[PDB]
Design an enzyme around this catalytic site. Structure first.
Site, PDB file in Angstrom:
ATOM      1  N   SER A  43       0.775  -1.307  -0.191  1.00 13.52           N
ATOM      2  CA  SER A  43       0.338  -0.390   0.083  1.00 13.52           C
ATOM      3  C   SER A  43       0.376   1.625   0.268  1.00 13.52           C
ATOM      4  CB  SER A  43      -0.728   0.447   1.097  1.00 13.52           C
ATOM      5  OG  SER A  43      -2.195  -0.372   1.252  1.00 13.52           O
ATOM      6  N   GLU A 139      -5.537  -3.635  -6.627  1.00  6.38           N
ATOM      7  CA  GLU A 139      -6.205  -3.721  -5.529  1.00  6.38           C
ATOM      8  C   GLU A 139      -6.653  -5.444  -5.434  1.00  6.38           C
ATOM      9  OE1 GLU A 139      -4.357  -3.271  -2.998  1.00  6.38           O
ATOM     10  OE2 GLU A 139      -3.675  -1.291  -2.846  1.00  6.38           O
TER      11      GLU A 139
HETATM   12  B1  LIG Z   1      -1.881  -1.677   1.952  1.00  9.42           B
HETATM   13  O1  LIG Z   1      -0.950  -2.624   2.290  1.00  9.42           O
HETATM   14  O2  LIG Z   1      -2.732  -2.083   2.749  1.00  9.42           O
HETATM   15  C1  LIG Z   1      -3.410  -2.503   3.431  1.00  9.42           C
HETATM   16  C2  LIG Z   1      -3.650  -2.779   1.954  1.00  9.42           C
HETATM   17  C3  LIG Z   1      -4.596  -4.613   2.447  1.00  9.42           C
HETATM   18  O3  LIG Z   1      -4.315  -5.034   1.510  1.00  9.42           O
HETATM   19  O4  LIG Z   1      -3.100  -2.777   1.741  1.00  9.42           O
END
Ligand SMILES: *[B@@]1([O])O[C][C]([C][O])O1
Length: 261
Positions: A43, A139
């Site tokens: 993220s 995502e």
């Molecule tokens: B990022 O890495 O922060 C939380 C989300 C979980 O998939 O992605």
């Protein structure tokens, strides 16, 4: 140096692979540990998506107020804010804030879509001089963090330089830059990571990342009280696919860096 000895020891104690880059803007000095090795961004990539949309808003002056519909099909695996607006709208500003401050994955996917796909996010990185960042997936699959997979990776050195340019430099317009800083300073997910290794008097803006292989990341701009700001990137990943997060490692690396100043 002393600090590299201690980071090496921390890494050895942790069982994983640690990447650190510090830029001290006072004298533009850098401290690097595995600074040119690739790490899964998870993220932390959301900073680049949000900054790309901000750059667009420099010409499309009302872009951030553009409403974007959140449909049930848009929901992925972690959508703390988007979930609150299903069958409604969020502006691009609200989506950027949600992606940065709550790590909302639906928000990130809407930002990627606004940029024309992951290639549009990567394109912005190239436009501001980051030849290393690459965003390949949306995502949630960009968090798979598979060892050796170059997809959705950057290096600590590259991310530190880019974060410096976005927040302290002038890669963005003055209003956009201030907006990004405000967003980063209001992150809610970072209390146990870099922030925890630093004096409570210091102001921090950061973006965490977590993924498979126990990947635990944090990138931060740091404003010490009466002292030039610092940019600190800490990336950590582990050999077991189901390893647990290790935010304590990021706190400890931050503490070691802070000690050496
Ligand atoms: B990022 O890495 O922060 C939380 C989300 C979980 O998939 O992605």
């Amino acid at each position: 140096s002393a600090v590299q000895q201690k980071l090496a020891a921390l890494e050895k104690s942790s069982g994983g692979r640690l990447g650190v880059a510090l830029i001290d803007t006072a004298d533009n000095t850098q401290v690097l540990y595995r600074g040119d090795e690739r790490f899964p961004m998870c993220s932390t990539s959301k900073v680049m998506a949000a900054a790309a949309v901000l750059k667009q808003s420099e010409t499309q002056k009302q872009l951030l107020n553009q409403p974007v519909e959140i449909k049930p099909a848009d929901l992925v695996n972690y959508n703390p804010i988007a979930e609150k607006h299903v069958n409604g709208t969020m502006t691009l500003a609200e989506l950027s804030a949600a992606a940065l401050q709550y790590s909302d994955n639906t928000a990130m996917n809407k930002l990627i879509a606004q940029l024309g796909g992951p290639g549009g996010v990567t394109a912005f990185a190239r436009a501001i001089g980051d030849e290393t960042f690459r965003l390949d997936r949306t995502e949630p699959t960009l968090n798979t963090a598979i060892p050796g997979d170059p997809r959705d990776t950057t290096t600590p050195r590259a991310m530190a330089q880019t974060l410096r340019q976005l927040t302290l430099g002038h890669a963005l317009g003055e209003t956009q830059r201030a907006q990004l800083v405000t967003w980063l300073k209001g992150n809610t997910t970072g209390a146990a990571s870099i922030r925890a290794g630093l004096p409570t008097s210091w102001t921090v803006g950061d973006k965490t990342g977590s993924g498979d292989y126990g990947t635990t990341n944090d990138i931060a701009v740091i404003w010490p009280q009466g002292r030039a700001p610092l940019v600190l990137v800490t990336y950590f990943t582990q050999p077991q696919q189901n390893a647990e997060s290790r935010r304590d490692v990021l706190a400890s690396a931050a503490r070691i860096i802070a000690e050496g100043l």
